[PDB]
Design a protein around this ligand. Structure first.
Ligand SMILES: [Cl-]
Ligand SMILES: [Cl-]
Lengths: 107, 186, 88, 107, 88, 186
């Protein structure tokens, strides 16, 4: 018959959930800016638990992108790409860059 | 038993197709076999160009753990959760069926009030919810929480189904009833 | 082209001369990037662009093709990392 | 503390609602294709109640775009633009175009 | 620049030499396009591109500016239609 | 009384700014006045370059019908529902407050079970929901559906607020409690 009434309900739900997701994304963004800062201000050994938190966050943001298909702002998309690989060799690279004053991941 | 995989998730990879995942319901899927994508949209055919069963098999999938199936030439917008992959010609999409349903009591987490002929709930089949309308049997004006009821359902989007298919009845995300497809109609 | 068993030795999952560490393999399915052997095979069969690992992991190379980038050890068959290419 | 668990819940809700909205959009698309066809197969007077349905649908799709901020596929976006104006003069124009075989609105 | 009352005669809402029909005015707020007088004023103050109404409604012209397209009767002040421009 | 408009909806127009709507809570807003956008994000200032009160006024808005406010230079992503527009310096954002709360009974549509110290519900202020954690008072280990309770709340995002501000407590979209801000803290 007429689908508009249930469609409106869904649309209102869409508006509310997106509002909430964007807020959550702002917190991830801030928390990551701060981890990057901390990592860049300490030595490599002491940075490992900080990297563990940083990559754990990236992993969750990757789950958002690929499992649930929420496409975030370019900044967070670039972050999800650049920080996906998590091993000794990527950590060595990012630690160096963040120590030299890099505030957000980029090539 | 003919192959059937309800689609849970979809992952697109540029220039090679789309990977769909789910738990195989019956049968076996092997690389190179043709399959149909049935439900919600008009049926389509495609070929597996890759299969992986989580921790167990490459290029074949069976009932049990999750299976990912790479379909060549299928782009993201052409496939959706709630469809099924199936051996061609073994299952069809339908919108109208006779059902046997149990309506949950309030104390079971269901509805508080009875519903009437204009009830438009969601019907959950395998991996997805679809809105449908109902036809109560003759002389029945209302269905009380806690009743069994035989009803005719008309979905607004087709679902792959056969007689015996179980479903849940849902309102706002909560289960308010459970049913079985008695007789497919159209 | 028939069913090939994935072997597990406690540390790695292996099949068709490819391998993934236990945790990386499970992580990919869990994060919504299923069928990692199928993905890696697509790369290997895409005439990929092959270069040294930019991060310098020993034995590893960077392969790019089929919409993906992979860090892969042609001697051991290990896929150390695989993800979609950067979106413009 | 850790926002991931509630974030996942929201993400799952996002996936479910978007799935549903896209389905609803497919029905609007089909219903509109059919109204356009009918309008193009009848005379101007008899087309008025058909245009009333067509613009009523456009109005709902416009509400979706502007009130709830759901951005649909290009096809539906073009439709929302081209069919926004609803009066005698736009009806005269669309009736003519649809009678000459136009299957979907476009300039 | 102070508060100017919007007048209503049963058929039109009017203010600052602009007017909207009752139903069109209400429809715009209802559909999530609020403050139609503010929108129309933006157009009028944007050095808009002015052409004849392409649909040929008598007395009306098409104005384009400030991200919007408007069908407007400079004699009566009536805004017959206003919406955002087509997105590329 | 200083101007306050909780933001419901936002409509962006290219090259001129963004129109925000809501119902004026108190005061008057006139074209040309400076305003602050308070809550959720860091505070920002801007100027009204247009105001319309639905069916009543151009370039001024008052309590009553909906008001649309055109803010020059504010782009869509810089403003959100749940913020407020306010006369500069008259309201501030906070995350931590003492509250007096009534928890709904089950029969009132609320919770079935009591909650404990790790309860993370949503707190609804004016037009939006914000997650927060709680600190129960000394010796209180659980709060039963149907209780009054004084609790300390910490929101995960700031909200424009003053003492006396009422709010609802929500879980899954349903109201489970109602409260008032007793004392703002930080
Ligand atoms: Cl390629
Ligand atoms: Cl302009």
């Amino acid at each position: 018959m007429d689908i508009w009434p249930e469609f409106q309900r869904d649309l209102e739900m869409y508006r509310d959930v997106v509002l909430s997701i964007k807020r959550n994304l702002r917190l991830y963004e801030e928390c990551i800016e701060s981890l990057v800062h901390q990592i860049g201000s300490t030595n490599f050994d002491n940075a490992q638990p900080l990297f563990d938190d940083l990559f754990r966050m990236q992993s969750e943001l990757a789950t958002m992108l690929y499992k649930y298909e929420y496409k975030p702002g370019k900044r967070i998309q670039d972050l999800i790409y650049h920080l996906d690989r998590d091993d000794f060799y990527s950590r060595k690279y990012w630690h160096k860059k963040f120590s030299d004053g890099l505030a957000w991941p980029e090539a | 038993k003919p192959f059937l995989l309800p689609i849970e998730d979809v992952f697109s990879i540029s220039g090679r197709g789309t990977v769909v995942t789910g738990r195989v319901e019956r049968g076996i899927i092997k690389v190179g076999e043709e399959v149909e994508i049935v439900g919600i949209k008009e049926t389509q055919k495609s070929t597996c160009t890759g299969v992986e069963m989580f921790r167990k098999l490459l290029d074949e999938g069976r009932a049990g753990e999750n299976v990912g199936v790479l379909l060549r030439g299928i782009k993201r917008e052409e496939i959706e959760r709630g469809q099924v992959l199936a051996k061609p010609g073994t299952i069809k999409p339908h919108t109208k069926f006779e059902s046997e349903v149990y309506i949950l009591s309030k104390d079971e987490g269901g509805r508080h009030t009875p519903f009437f002929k204009g009830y438009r709930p969601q019907f959950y089949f395998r991996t997805t919810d679809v809105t449908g309308t109902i036809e109560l049997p003759e002389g029945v004006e209302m269905v009380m929480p806690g009743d069994n009821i035989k009803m005719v359902v008309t979905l607004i989007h087709p679902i792959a189904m056969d007689d015996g298919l179980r479903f849940a009845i849902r309102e706002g995300g909560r289960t308010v009833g459970a049913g079985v497809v008695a007789k497919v109609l159209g | 082209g028939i069913g090939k068993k994935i072997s597990f030795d406690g540390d790695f999952y292996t099949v068709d001369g490819m391998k993934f560490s236990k945790s990386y393999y499970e992580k990919l399915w869990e994060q919504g990037r299923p069928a990692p052997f199928v993905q890696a095979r697509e790369v290997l069969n895409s005439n990929p662009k092959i270069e040294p690992d930019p991060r310098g992991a020993p034995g590893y190379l960077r392969y790019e093709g089929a919409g993906l980038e992979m860090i892969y050890n042609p001697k051991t068959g290990q896929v150390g990392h695989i993800q979609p290419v950067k979106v413009k």
